[model samples]
Target: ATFEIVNRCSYTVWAAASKGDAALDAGGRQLNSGESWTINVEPGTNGGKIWARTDCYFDDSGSGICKTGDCGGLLRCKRFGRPPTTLAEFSLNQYGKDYIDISNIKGFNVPMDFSPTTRGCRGVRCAADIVGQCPAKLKAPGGGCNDACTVFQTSEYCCTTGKCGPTEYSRFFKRLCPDAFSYVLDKPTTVTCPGSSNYRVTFCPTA
Candidate 1:
């Protein structure tokens, strides 16, 4: 599947993707406002994640830090980035169907829109100002909102053990973006499309 990653935010954003332990799109790239990058996913690929990094500075050697979504201070990430980031997750050509969703299980940094361009499939976005409205306890020091699981680290919020239900914090995120997954054990928010479909991920999308 072909994937288009766009930056609609006013500032520069570094885009990153990971499929399990393998990096995609060279792992990361620097994108200015109105810029974009495209990536292709292998057939039968699953458990992939794409996210955006903000307030980043990378030297010529591709090493630096980002206020949000830093991956070991490398411009090209080799693993999943740090939390407090909005994610676009997907599994393509698995069982002949492609599944996609937006998740804030780790936290929320920027707003995002994830959609398929074909197959008449519906799109999902989390464009709410989660950072501005973040609850005091869930606020990240750098910026953006941190999940209760990250903040408290307890099973009640982390869903590390048995079946867990949504808490007040998860409910807060759910209320803002019902189409996005709010926690590890939250009900499925996945949308499915054909294996031939192409997808788009937009940062700081409007409507």
Candidate 2:
């Protein structure tokens, strides 16, 4: 008699088997994604069991959304004596389309009705001050203000409210007019001390 094992998940899985009441251990062999394996059995052999283990991780490589706890607790071991009458199906629900879609989708959008009251070195207002620290010659599109340091030192630049000064303005624009303000990089990189450029040159996409 012969038996077959199948994988139905997008990610790879591991399968193991024990004969005659043997214990399942971690040294099981790994199975490729969407793959299968077959085994032959003696006519009267019984008490054999097969099980699958998984090591798939979250897409973002972070433990926040997908964690070890999310993997289904140990799966039930299948019993074999003669070949199974029907094909056996095994899959990790965590890797299913529905689970991945729901987990990856954003639950909410940025609030539309937000207003800042104070105007200084804090919050949105402080952003303006930070831009003021930049050099004066840098030019941004729309004849708007450009961060001084970034203008001459690096190609990074921005123009908002017909005024630009320092990276601070860029940060503030992102926070307040997230939709309106546009810069080369969303979350610019940090300029070092000797550089004292105090510029951010990295881009971060909105979630």
- For model 2, what is the alpha-carbon lDDT of residue 185? 38
How many Å off is the CA of 116 in candidate 2? 67
**lDDT of all predictions, in order shown?**
0.90, 0.28
Models 1 onward score TM values of 0.96, 0.25
Deviation from truth (RMSD, Å), model 2: 25.5
lDDT of 1 by residue, 41-111 (tens): 77777898999998898999999999889988989887888889999999888877889999999899999
Summed over model 1, clashes come to: 0
Report residue 140 deviation for candidate 2 (angstroms).
Answer: 54
Best by TM-score: 1
- In candidate 2, position 119 carries an lDDT of 24
